[model samples]
Target: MAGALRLVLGDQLSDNLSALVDADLSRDQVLMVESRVEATAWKHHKQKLVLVWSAMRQFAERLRARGFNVRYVTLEDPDNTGSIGGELRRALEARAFDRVIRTACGKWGLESHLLSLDLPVPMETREDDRFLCSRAQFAAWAEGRRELRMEFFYREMRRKTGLLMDGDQPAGGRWNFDAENRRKLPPGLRPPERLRIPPNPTTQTVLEQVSRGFDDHFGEVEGFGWPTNPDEATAILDHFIADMLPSFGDWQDAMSWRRPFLWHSLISPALNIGLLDPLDICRRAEAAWREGRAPLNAVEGFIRQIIGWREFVRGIYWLKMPEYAQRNALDAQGKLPGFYWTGQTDMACVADTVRAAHDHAYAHHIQRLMVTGNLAMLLGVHPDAVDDWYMVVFADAYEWVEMPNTRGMATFADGGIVGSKPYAASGAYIDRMSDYCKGCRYDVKKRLGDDACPFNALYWDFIDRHAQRLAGNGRMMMPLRTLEKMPDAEREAFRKQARALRVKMGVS
Candidate 1:
């Protein structure tokens, strides 16, 4: 009897994936492809390319060792087709199979393409159970609700999972510890050493291949240190729980020119790539708090991000995709500046953020949300342009997570769906949060002038331009009122200086 053909995507690299769970080793065969089209779909960072390829190759080796016949296609294969559909077609042409079994894809485009392919046999797309909240569950939760807020969804998740819960009430008598988590990084504070998985023969070979093929890509591939398999990923998570979770809440939002990973767990890549399970990670954090190894504020904050925000964003992505991708509520039209790729800018804070991204292909939430994402919103960069840049650079970026965070939270491009208001800010916010503004070329104190920080003028201009659209938003009232009370001459000065700066930067 011929068995089904199991297709495993690059991101779905876990052993417990639904498509592989009940597969019969004697009759079933697995197929994995390293598509050149997918690799070069966007000019991905060289390190990101290496990470995905190496992880896929390692996953194939693992499946074969477990007594399953696996057909793995490498990028260097002579007869390799450059697309998923092409590879699947080739596989079907070579042999007979009863059906094709695959877990649903993370990207909407890929999923649609896979479903529409006219294969010879039946195809069964299984539900991806990796996430805590299923799409159907999220839809039921969101049905008939006028506003889709993360706080409401988060509480439901807390209750459902019994994480940090005390018999139907929150453990700390509060649902969120965000207020306590906002403290700035004090002087002389340093982050713990980041855990590294030294490159093995497999990773090193993939690194060389990526370097040769994607030399023109954005980031460096020399120091590729991400975990490629489940064991290494679990070790990285354990290291964070022991050494970093104590102060993770305090400095999670704080930025530093000297440190990139300030008590922040860099396990997003592992979690996103299916190396580590989300529910298991949350349980570990809960156990840490229960055992009194980490404080409640730290543990709760860390768990909220994984189970709360992470799950909420994924739910919203599935509920409103296809049309959601085209949303431009702000009607922003600015072009993404060339400096994002080159990391050459007079603004010290922006330059530092870009440099961090280029060197490590990673930056903390503050550097991403407050620095790069905020600047693009203030400059009125189109959501499409901003989304592309973010998707291209980050190793952890996938459309399901990146789209909501970028368009909805960062730019307010989705009309208050993901966030109540735009995360717009002047240089003062950055100056207060980090030391990047101390030696900056622009004056953080001045509001208008050649030497004044561009963020100051752009901040006011952004508010003024969007005042009508934001007039009814209660969270925006304070900023809107301040803009309204400005003297005519002062307001004109801000607009004039902002226009000049926009022209200088070639924004829009």
Candidate 2:
């Protein structure tokens, strides 16, 4: 019970949080809720639950030590109302406050709920200023345009931030080095072991709470390696810059059978949460290139993910809310297979991707996009089903960032809003990119049959099934042309194969 109830969400953990900016610490009391209602609204991975709760707990401790009154409602608190709104009401009943000062909520449902609430006093909301580009700037860039491209948005970001810029030109005279980033790992290379932070006393207690509370969640909580505080987040970035940045670009799209994390930054959970700053992380990567510690392709590629894709998706999410969530361009209608939860598929790539999700609550981009996500699109899973699984499984996922990637980039549900083409691929592409196919039970080269790779059949069938909707996409023309010259019997054969695979997997 203090004067102004300063509200903080699980993801807004920055020290200079907008809700606490220009704070009268003596009068302000921070309220953070460990809401079981929100946690259980979707079947989230166990590790994800631990990361958020533990991070929030640590932030509260830091706030208290800095001479601010913090009222954190632990999950086990007897009087805990299992909702953010309910917790706020309970706080108000305890005492009087002048007004509520809060940063804008990240989730659409909660934001709208908080805005429309019937409260005794007014709420002063502020923009989440941590992102490099504001939603307004993104809308301006996206307005009056026939198409939205990340490269154009990315170039503007580079100019505004002065990152990787050499005299108003991009460093190395290239805005992007994507072409140089597709090499597979050599036969005898050693992927560096990324740093892992053992859970602290606070994290350990939260781990036990999550263990008991979410025993049936999708992933394991035992090997919790996520950074729970700012110092730990910095350590992770330090490790990535020194040990992984040089090889990050070349293998960014590559995958391995032996390693779940291969030179990947694994900093998404920290960045998506407010533990790490986006622009600061990008600047560090640029500095690595400037100091000759990392390659231009590596540094630029790393920075693009932070400034380019991350901000672009955030902008899209805000601009197209409620409607964006319902887009299913191809009208895909299959169920998500059960093996996605259990890692029980015979397809090595998918089983392994799910394994990564189970063990670490993570998968690098290639594994997410090409391996599981590609297969989902080719199988014609409903975009909503796909979005739900991605939302529940990945620790770094928030609806703002997760929705656009699923609906647009991964599944083409947004009809080319976020990506020009659906990321559908055949088994041959998987073979080229990863060692997963090397040990896979199915034949990577075969088009159809019992022993043939499911991706091959699904790839051809996807093109055939969604031909009319995809006909206007120029990027899909080559595959369409390939399908055209294909004999009627061959097309029918693969269609049957895809159907049979879908039936066997219980997704038909």
Candidate 3:
């Protein structure tokens, strides 16, 4: 009566894990391993490595406490070899289990490993991800669609789940609240302090290991405390609802040099690792609407980001990974500067956001999209380099979530997948949204000098470089027309300074 040996990936650490839900615990063996190959492959952020390892260890212990036989492997264990495939082979040879059960891998490399296993027994991959939709389901939904928009997919999900739906109709006669969520924060606005989870010893141990083993990794790890389990993740969610959600809508797109985590939910890391369920979070936001604790714009905006955008991006990742990672639709080519990893830049916003990441392994969305990601794109950092940096640097970065955000949204490397045109804006946009321009060494106004902000000149260069591909797009005509209106000599001055700055930044 021996049961199936179940394999659980580090990211699949939910208590109601699909791998374990129908498990024959009395006779089954649960396999969890600390694969150094996986950990070392990306030179991942110390906080990211710590969080995943700590969560995996905790999950193994939980399974043991529930009377399940768990084969837990540690990275530093004397008997351990490196890879998941190797460890699984060793485990299968030693154990008497008749079959292996695993949920589909979220990463392509790992999925191929699972498929290529030279096993003595049968293997069954499960399809239930607890996500609202599956890969096959999303593909079927995408058939004959002219464009795979998130709003359309979100409406389908809403209808299927009966969430925010009045029978066959959407609740409040609307689908998206995006327009109401665009206003910038007034100067001097202060966000409520985010709920901070002090690191417990279990997390501390993993942090120390990452520090010692991954000292050569790209990012610094000064204040390296991030929640490693579902309980702490739940507490952070509760804190966001009570303290941050009220103003989250208005300031969601706002950025400032003085503040990084302003009025935003820093809950994505937890949600990505199955610590917090998106559906549950969306329900809580809707419930907040009913209670009048937050406005419809605030609650709906938050929900759309999670249930609408997150899932839409995830579906696209599945639909386009392996090839997606290699996409360079914009044909941008340049090396990412040394300052990206070091925080040694003269630019205030870049320095602030980079240093914040070094300190806490976190940055709010605008700090990511507008400042760091924006600079990288305009400076022409190759998409692959940017993609690797994003994949390795954040505690929340799973490939499915990270790629579209980096390639499509951040850099426009996918051309028109997430954005139709390059989100190229000059130093003025930063000055409006943030206080960084106030204290910078360069003039935000001047476009062609040593003291001129590189962003202002480079913004023009980016548009100039992509003019042929973008000029015909309806969304890009406004910017193109504005560029045409600039006097020929003035535009030439901007482009000349831009070329010099690009050389100065070593971007070419």
Q: List the residue pairs that clash in candidate 2.
A: none
Q: Write the per-residue lDDT of candidate 2 for residues 50-128, one digit (tens) a residue.
A: 8998999889889999999899998889999899889998998887899999998668988999898888888888999
**In candidate 3, residue 204 scores what lDDT?**
82
Task: Give the TM-scores of the predictions, in the order they appear.
Answer: 0.98, 0.98, 0.96
Q: Model 3 — which ten-residue stretch has the worst lDDT?
A: 180-189
- Residue 474 in model 3: shift from native, Å? 1.5
Error of 3 at 398 (Å): 1.1
Each candidate structure's count of clashing pairs: 0, 0, 0
| Candidate 2 residue-wise lDDT at 433 | 81
Q: Write out the backbone clash pairs for model 1.
A: none
Model 2 stretches with alpha carbons more than 4 Å out: none
Which run of 10 residues does model 1 get worst, by summed lDDT? 180-189
